[PDB]
Amino acid sequence: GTILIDLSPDDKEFQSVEEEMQSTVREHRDGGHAGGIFNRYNILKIQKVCNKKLWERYTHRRKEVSEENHNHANERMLFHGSPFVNAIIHKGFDERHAYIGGMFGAGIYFAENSSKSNQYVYGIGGGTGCPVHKDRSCYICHRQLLFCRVTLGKSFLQFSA
Amino acid sequence: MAHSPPGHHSVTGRPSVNGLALAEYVIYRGEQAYPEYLITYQIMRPE
Numbered sequence: 001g002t003i004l005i006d007l008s009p010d011d012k013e014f015q016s017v018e019e020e021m022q023s024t025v026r027e028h029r030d031g032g033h034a035g036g037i038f039n040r041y042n043i044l045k046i047q048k049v050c051n052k053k054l055w056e057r058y059t060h061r062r063k064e065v066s067e068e069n070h071n072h073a074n075e076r077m078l079f080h081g082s083p084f085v086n087a088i089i090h091k092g093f094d095e096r097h098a099y100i101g102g103m104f105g106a107g108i109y110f111a112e113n114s115s116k117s118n119q120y121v122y123g124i125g126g127g128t129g130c131p132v133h134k135d136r137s138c139y140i141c142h143r144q145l146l147f148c149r150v151t152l153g154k155s156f157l158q159f160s161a
Numbered sequence: 162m163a164h165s166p167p168g169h170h171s172v173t174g175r176p177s178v179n180g181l182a183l184a185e186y187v188i189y190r191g192e193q194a195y196p197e198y199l200i201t202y203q204i205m206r207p208e
């Protein structure tokens with residue numbers, strides 16, 4: 001059901017998404033252990049993900065949550081890095097994409113910092129790095145992140161250490 | 162997969178020590194997200 005439409009680097013949509021990726025890179029307290037050492041990315045491709053079944057599931061649930069929260073979905077665009085990105089774009093998010101050991105509970109995690117999600121692209125803590133070189137700071141191999149439309153509803157605020 | 166805190170739809174994890182860390186979020190249903198863009202990229206080695 002999923003089709004992927006390449007965006008042109010001249011297209012404003014591509015540019016806004018790249019800007020969201022580039023501008024939300026920060027330094028990490030692990031000094032790059034998990035996600036590598038970089039201040040920016042080389043963006044190779046941005047594709048729009050189109051799946052009617054999955055979109056309608058999302059909006060059905062978005063409306064549900066809107067109604068339970070003063071008509072406010074509290075919808076955001078957020079990043080997600082996973083070794084399971086191929087499965088997510090074809091079948092959707094579900095329980096197998098959950099971070100069972102996560103510090104805010106066993107759920108599906110997203111980040112405003114692109115560089116935070118980059119730490120998960122090869123697995124938790126970066127696993128063993130890229131599959132061709134076993135290098136968590138590989139500069140050669142091609143990585144993929146999702147920039148996702150997310151319904152937060154009423155969101156329990158947990159301050160973290 | 163756990164449940165949302167009762168009466169809530171999600172958790173906002175807000176770093177309180179790193180002033181430059183942005184927020185991170187958890188959802189407890191896959192239907193609360195749509196994987197809209199797929200970005201293919203390299204990290205770049207600093208000059």
Ligand SMILES: COc1ccc(-c2cc(=O)c3ccc(O)cc3o2)cc1
Binds near residue numbers: 079109110124
């Ligand atoms: C399938 O196991 C996974 C997949 C993705 C992630 C993941 C992916 C993320 O993008 C992510 C961002 C911020 C954060 O605090 C946690 C995060 O976790 C974790 C475990």
Ligand SMILES: [Zn+2]
Binds near residue numbers: 134
């Ligand atoms: Zn590599």
